[PDB]
């Protein structure tokens, strides 16, 4: 019939073409009502501090503080050296260093061999 839309990593499926959006069951009513309840409670807890006149400053958001503490602090104490961590720290850790090492060493050996054989046009090359 029709071409079915293919989702991707950078092209998500729409809300309309997802089947689980069309759930009518009461457990989905419970989950949606609890999400609405948590969101309404957090909205109320925010805008009681936001609309307060006696507060003049920053309504601190512990989800934001928790996000920054996860992006900075929680990186080392939850590390475990295993096969996956060591192989991925050896691929992107000492891989491209070795790559550019052999590339630049090859080109510099080529250029040195051409200079000591009188081949490289180093005529007007007096700034270096």
């Amino acid at each position: 019939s029709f071409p079915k839309y293919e989702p991707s990593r950078l092209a998500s499926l729409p809300t309309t073409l997802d089947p689980a959006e069309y759930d009518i069951s009461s457990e989905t009513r419970k989950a949606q009502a609890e999400r609405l309840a948590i969101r309404s409670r957090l909205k109320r807890e925010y805008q009681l501090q936001y609309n307060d006149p006696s507060r003049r400053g920053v309504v601190e958001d512990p989800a934001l503080i928790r996000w920054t503490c996860a992006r900075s602090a929680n990186v080392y104490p939850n590390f475990r050296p295993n096969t996956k961590t060591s192989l991925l720290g050896a691929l992107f850790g000492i891989g491209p260093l070795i790559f550019w090492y052999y590339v630049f060493k090859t080109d510099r050996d080529r250029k040195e061999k051409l200079i000591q054989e009188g081949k490289l046009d180093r005529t007007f090359n007096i700034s270096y």
């Binding site: 729409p14 949606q32 609405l36 309840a37 909205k43 109320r44 609309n51 006149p53």
Partner: protein, 177 residues
Amino acid sequence: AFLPSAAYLTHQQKVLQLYKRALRHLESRCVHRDKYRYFACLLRARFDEHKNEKDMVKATQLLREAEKEFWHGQHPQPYIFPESPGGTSYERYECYKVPEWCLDDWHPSEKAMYPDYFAKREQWKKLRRESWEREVKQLQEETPVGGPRTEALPPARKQGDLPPLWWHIVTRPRERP
């Protein structure tokens, strides 16, 4: 799906929103006005063919392949209104929307440039601060246990009181400063 009051979309709301998005994407497909108006009555007939469908599972399936029809026939760049999100003039003046509390940080030599304005702003702030504790003690006795269920707020009940959580909605910046 994601709404402030309801936790979902009713089937009636889904039908109306799909009808509206179909007409908007159709008007994007069908630039001229008489031509779009002809196809708009044709599409209204197509939507009113199964308006009287009692079976909600069959109406669910019909709505699902109607979404597939709408996705197969959508315009790639539909007409977005300029101040609608995705428009060319959307959120353009947000760099001019200074919050009101910055008037509190003015120097008194320029506060004296507009005497009536700040002399009235003092009693606006007075109104806000003698309304605040009354609307807090209004919200604390009406909210159920576990917090409020829905994001909607109750209105001002007594005479003389103000509706709760009102200052940033009333004193919001104009859309064209």
